Symmetry: D4
Subunit: 113 residues, 8 copies
């Protein structure tokens, strides 16, 4: 159970040490930040695009080293895409989801991929 940064932006406590990964993460934080300012279609498209792109790249990176925790990781990802495809305006959920996902699921692959 991790703190929710305020303002909702990436900080170095989220570093995975995979610079590509971290840079993509920065875009998810920003995506959620925009929704938190105006829940509209431009903002959701922006978050949705970045999310889909990051999840697939990250998935690719896991596959490249035949990561053993892939399947569970991909299912987490897919659930979240799914929430975005049926967006309900629950910004709070999203803020929480990302913090947790990174600090628990992503942090797990460090050193194995």
């Amino acid at each position: 159970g991790f703190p929710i940064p305020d303002p909702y932006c990436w900080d170095i406590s989220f570093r995975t040490f995979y610079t590509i990964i971290d840079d993509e993460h920065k875009t998810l934080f920003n995506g959620i930040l925009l929704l938190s300012q105006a829940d509209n279609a431009d903002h959701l498209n922006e978050l949705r695009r970045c999310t889909g792109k990051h999840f697939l790249n990250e998935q690719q990176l896991m596959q490249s080293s035949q990561y053993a925790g892939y399947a569970e990781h991909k299912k987490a990802h897919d659930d979240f895409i799914h929430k975005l495809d049926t967006w309900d305006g629950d910004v709070t959920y999203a803020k929480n989801w990302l913090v947790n996902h990174i600090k628990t699921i992503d942090f797990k692959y460090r050193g194995k991929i």
Copy 2:
């Protein structure tokens, strides 16, 4: 229901703002233009090649961001390839199909991929 450019060439009203996409689109317009001048095998091969190439690239681009409207988009594409594989000389259909596809189906992915 959009106007059919005359001569049948790409114009900036078709811009998707994905330069690779737009450049490929220019080749589909030209492909249909040739058929409209001489319905022969050279012209149809030319259009067919460009169409198959563009549809797959565009499909790839959609997949890279796990675009939610992929499946419907790919089925549209496949139907059209199919018409080209059973070419009937209906140039009018083709002129119409492309204008519409771009301005309705392709324009839909803008900002999401």
Copy 3:
């Protein structure tokens, strides 16, 4: 003196047999056609972007086989960019320039790159 297509569009007489080159050429015909319809900034940008890109790609293809005619060919490309960058609205010049360039300068690399 090669004939100037009317409408000013690519035809199979311009084929180089390098599909990537041919698809790019189609974009240069389109760029000149748009300027002939309306000599504005959007149209010139489009043509200028496609030209710079095509010239560099073709240059790279020449370099990959250490093509003996590279220097002279690069100089010809560069002279045309210069014309685009100091654009005077002479569409006639451009229409002629492109037809001639493909049919006499580009046609000379066929089989050598």
Copy 4:
């Protein structure tokens, strides 16, 4: 004089329509925000890495179409690196620099690369 976002995060007013460019820009906003929270070595490293990378990638994109404004644009980038490399802690300068750069220097390549 463009408005300085507060919190200092990317918004869609900064859109260039080049998704890769936009995602990188988001990382530069984040880098400046972290320094505004704490002017330390980690934060500066992060910003410096993202900046060097973005500047080189954008430069490459400009080169790929032989963009006529390249030289002047590269010089502007280089002047900012210099500022990062001789960092004096002037966060205000940086916040202004980035907003201005995107909205007047980067916006000028749109449609040309």
Copy 5:
């Protein structure tokens, strides 16, 4: 029914005008030539490697433009790999197979891929 070159080497009558394709073809001719000089394991490995590599690349090239005659083309390829995997020393067959395959099946994709 085409002539069998003697010596068994590639000639320009086999040009497909896809330089990558032609260069790979040259290696298949050489592969069969070696077997024709000494039917041993080194020579067959050499032909087998080149064959497998060429067939997959060529297949990839067909897929890139969603070539309509792919399936029939791939099945031809697979039959031949199969003969190589159960090599019987029938060099005559191999000499014949390749000449025919190129001049009938490969020549068919020209202009469509």
Copy 6:
């Protein structure tokens, strides 16, 4: 039945003459060496990552030339990943497995891929 190098490091008797392959092999030897010094999680992650990466690359290389002994080779690989995913501390097995795998299974693809 091959000797187990002591110290457990790669030597030129293991050369496959595929430099990429050999360089990756060097990392598997090192991975097993670390486990042999301290059976901990850091060391096993390190070996596991390198193993998964090498097996997939090698598999890719085999596929590129449609290697006939792929299926048997991939099943060997997968069994070993499997032992790593259920690590028992049997370092002896691992030392043996690798020496053998390289000198018997990997040496088999030489000249065919």
Copy 7:
């Protein structure tokens, strides 16, 4: 003095153990063989294209490991291009040049790149 193959085709005595290099070499043997059958423009183009390409690729491979013999090796390649570019029809020279080059200059990079 290495023996000149007759027919003038690549054999496994020319193996470098770099499959990409070996496949390219096969194209250079073929190019010289065609010229020995008919000293014309098509044949010379073919050889000249394959040579320029091979020389640049091999050069790149040398550079990737910072090969200490690069300069001298590049100079040898360049001298041969020069001969192709000022072609006098001396097929004998070419047959000798290539055999010697591979067996004494290329063989020296083996194990170093």
Copy 8:
């Protein structure tokens, strides 16, 4: 003065957190170890190849973020190549050189590239 591993193999104390860099480093330890077992041509070739390659790759990684320490770092690499190219058999020097280089010069780019 960092401790010299014995046996002379990579350990996790050398981690840079760049997996590609770490895997390459492992090859440099191995190269020096082989020379300590037998100071011959094969061993030196191996080390020299791996070194040239690693130095260039790491250099490229530094350039991709316009790393401010590049020049000085390149000079250090080049001085070592020089030592390998004028090899005197001083294994002691090499063992020390590598440990020191990683732990003080490479460690300085962490977080910046």
